[PDB]
Every structure is written in C-alpha cells, then in structure tokens.
Write a protein that binds this ligand. Structure first.
Ligand code: NIB
Ligand code: NIB
Ligand code: MG
Ligand code: MG
Lengths: 5, 236, 236, 5
C-alpha cells in the first residue's frame, strides 16, 4: 500500500 | 453522548493518556467528546483527533483487506463452497468501518469545517473529509459509489485550492494533503498519471522552498517529502 | 447472547477468520458464543478460545501497566498535581480488564471445567482458570486480594496434580502450565525460589523425555522448554 | 516481563 498521513 | 459529563480539558488529557497506552478506540471516543463541546480545536487537538481515528480506521481497513482477499479466493474456480460466513464477517467489518467514517464526517460537518477560518485548520479538516470519503470509496460497490468518490475529490480539491493560495510549499499540512490526494488519484480515481504528476510537482516545489526553513521545520517537511518520493518509487 | 442465533460451526469458522484478520475482540466474542452452545470443545477449539482471550487481556494488561506507571510517577515528590484523570482512566481500563477475566472465568465455571474428563482438556481449563485469577491478582488491592491469589494457586495446583499423574513431562500443556505457574510464584506469590525450582525441574524432566518423541513433537516441546530457560535466565 | 503461554 502507498504512504498516506 | 457518554462523554457529555466530562470536562473538555479532562477529555484531552485522557486522549493523550490513551495514545501513550496505544488505546486508539478510547482515544477517538475522548476526542469525539472534546469536539462535541462545540469549541474550535487547537493544532495539538487536531493532531490528537486525526491520530486517533487514523489508527482506528487503519486497523479496520487492514482487517477488511484480509477478509476481502479470502472472499475473492473463495469465489475463484475450484474453490470449495464454504457458505455465507466469509461474506457475512467481511460485511460486519465493513459496516463497522463505514460507521467510523460516518462518525468522523459527522464531526467535520457538525461543525468543525464551518467554523474553521484559518488556512491550517480549514485545509486540515477538508483533507480529513477527503480521507474518510476515500475510505468509504475503498469499500463501496453500489449506486452511490461515484458520488462517494466525487465527495472525496471535492473535499481534497477545496483543500488544495486553499493550500496553494495560503500556505508555503513546505507546509506539512499542504504536503500531507498532496500526498493523500495523490494516493486518491492512483488508488480510487484510476488516474495514475495525475497521481504521479501531483507527487512530483509537490516534491519539487517543496525542495525549492527548503532554504527558507529552520532545522526543525526542515526535518518536518523532508519527512513528508520522503513519503512522496517513496510513492513515486513504488509507481515508476 | 448476541451470538445465540449463529450456528456453532459458523462461530468457529468466523473465529478463525478473525484470527487471520488480527480481530481478537471479535475472535473472543465468536468463541464465547461457541462455548455457550453447551457442547464440549475440541483441542483446536480450546486453542482458539485461549488465543482470543490471551490477546484481548494481553492488550489490556499492557495498557494498564502504562497507565499505572504514569499514576505512580504522579504520586512521587515534586510531581505536579494533575487531578483525578490518570486514576480515573487507569480505573476504566482496570474495570474492563476485570470484566474480561470474569467473562472467561464464567465460561470455565459454566460449564467447561465440570464436563472436562480427559487430562488434556481438564488441565488446559484449570490452567486458564489460574491465568485469569492471576490477571485479577495483578490489579487487586482490596479485602479479597489474598482470596484472588489463592484462587489462582488452587486452580494451578489442581492442574499440576493431574498433569503429573496423567501426562508425560514433555506434553506441551503440562509444560505451559508449569511455565505459567512458575511465573505466578515469581510475580504474584512473592516466591522466586519456588518459581526457579519449578522451572528448572520442569525443564530437566522434559529434557530427559525428549528421546521418546517424533520430530514434530520435539519441536513443540522444545519451543516451550526454551521459554522456561528464558525465564530462568531472567531470574538467575 | 517473563514468558507465559
Ligand atoms: C497547526 C495544525 O493544525 N497542525 C500542524 C501540526 C500537525 C497537525 C495539524 C501535526 C503534524 N503531523 C505530521 O507532521 C505527521 N502527520 C501528518 C502530517 C500532515 C497532515 Cl495534513 C496530517 C498528518 C506526523 C506523523 O508522521 C507524518 C507527518 C501536522
Ligand atoms: C488437545 C488440546 O486441548 N490442546 C493441545 C494443543 C494446544 C491447545 C490445547 C495448542 C498448543 N499451543 C502451543 O503449543 C503454544 N501455546 C500454548 C501451549 C501450551 C498451553 Cl497450556 C497453552 C498455550 C502455541 C504458541 O506458542 C507457545 C506454545 C496447545
Ligand atoms: Mg496541477
Ligand atoms: Mg515440587
């Protein structure tokens, strides 16, 4: 999964 | 609300304790109580609210993905019929996730966003609105799926427009919004080129503004820039 | 009970799914439902029940220890008065933990233990009874603390007596019981010498019986023997 | 904390 904040 | 009798300051204190104890459901409930006092949130308090719900929904999303994968495998050719249980339990987790998303969106709509006049607060809440519609979109399969996707897009776009006018390109809120909207494009909107363009342009404009920053601001901004780079590496 | 309408087999299936999803609260609720069907549990089903509640209570214990430490520091000299919040939140977590312990002890008493006639099942349930009284003892400060400690001791002792008569010294249930009763002695009963003696004697008698085992049984037994050694190393 | 199972 891609990075999110 | 079960937190209606507790002091605002005590709710915030307990949210911090819950964070230390890794009790994120409690943390979220405390922060929900604090929001419902009706006063605007400070920067620290916005962090607590967002951390709490991110952790709760993050766990639910991870569980949903495990169950969805098992369900998908059960529907392949040669897989033995195991009955309705996998679908039922995936639906149970899904419904709980949707409930949390609805709770957060409810707090934003009643009345965090409408009272948020400063760029930092308004962009932060609109980003959250985009995020929780994005989580709804991840699990949506019905008549409203396009509207849910568009609700996320609209919230992110409004946040982007404000951020570009009101915040420097290194502002961590502006960066985190861009990171997440980029992921929305890649994972939800089937727009990988837009995702890549956004991440690249965000990274490059931030790079060019780092010279203006203190050491501590530099650390904060570069941390998020690395996440943009990580995603670009994943996608190219 | 909210699981009263679900098939026993479906509850067990869903417990396994919950385990895969790391949804231990759900796992525990499913297994509680399964127990309440009133049929005896199989070996696999005992594993599921114990895994679920171990994970739930384990998380609560970790949280309680974080909060208790903060509370203890708040009561030292020179610490600023922060009001009742730390005590209140530690109490909240404590009450939830006690609730889970009471739930498990309830399942054991109604009616798992009384129907358990085979050594493996009876020792396993009595060990669980000792464990959940031990967790109650960890947080106890009142009139009943000695009785709670003695309830744990009594359950562990009955399990030990059966295990020594009915099971080989390498049996994983016999080993795990001994490991945990040893920890009870060290941490709860203020009897570190008894704890060390038990762990050592258990380890050595197991070592001498390994020659009788298959490769797979050897792996199972030696895993727990290493835990005994780990504790001995911690304590000596 | 010591090991338990
Ligand atoms: C003043 C104000 O409202 N805020 C500024 C300070 C934060 C909250 C909002 C805390 C800080 N968080 C971070 O830098 C990290 N997470 C994050 C960044 C940006 C956004 Cl939009 C959301 C979350 C902390 C965790 O590692 C990633 C960066 C913004
Ligand atoms: C037949 C029966 O009732 N049982 C035997 C098989 C187990 C459940 C009870 C699973 C097995 N578990 C383990 O070996 C581990 N945990 C554990 C061992 C012993 C006891 Cl008493 C409780 C738990 C698995 C995790 O690593 C440690 C050993 C016993
Ligand atoms: Mg553009
Ligand atoms: Mg002895």
């Amino acid at each position: 999964f891609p990075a999110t904040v | 609300g079960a937190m209606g009798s507790m002091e605002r300051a005590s709710l915030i204190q307990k949210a911090k304790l819950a964070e230390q104890a890794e009790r994120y459901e409690d943390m979220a409930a405390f922060m929900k109580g604090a929001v419902e006092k009706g006063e605007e949130l400070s920067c620290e308090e916005r962090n607590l609210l967002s951390v709490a719900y991110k952790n709760v929904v993050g766990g639910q999303r991870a569980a949903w993905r495990v169950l969805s994968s098992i369900e998908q495998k059960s529907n392949e050719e040669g897989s033995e019929e195991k009955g309705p249980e996998v679908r039922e339990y995936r639906e149970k987790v899904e419904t709980e996730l949707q409930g949390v998303c609805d709770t957060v969106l409810g707090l934003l709509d009643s009345h965090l966003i409408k009272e948020a006049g400063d760029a930092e607060s308004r962009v932060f809440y609109l980003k959250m609105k985009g995020d929780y519609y994005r989580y709804l979109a991840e699990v949506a399969t019905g008549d409203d799926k396009k509207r849910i996707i568009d609700s996320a897009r609209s919230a992110y776009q409004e946040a982007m427009d404000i951020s570009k006018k009101e915040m420097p390109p290194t502002n961590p809120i502006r960066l985190g919004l861009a990171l997440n909207f980029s992921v929305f494009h890649y994972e939800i909107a089937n727009s990988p080129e837009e995702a890549i363009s956004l991440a690249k342009t965000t990274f490059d404009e931030a790079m060019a503004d780092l010279h203006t920053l203190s050491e501590d601001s530099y650390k904060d901004s570069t941390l998020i820039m690395q996440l943009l780079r990580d995603n670009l590496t994943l996608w190219t």
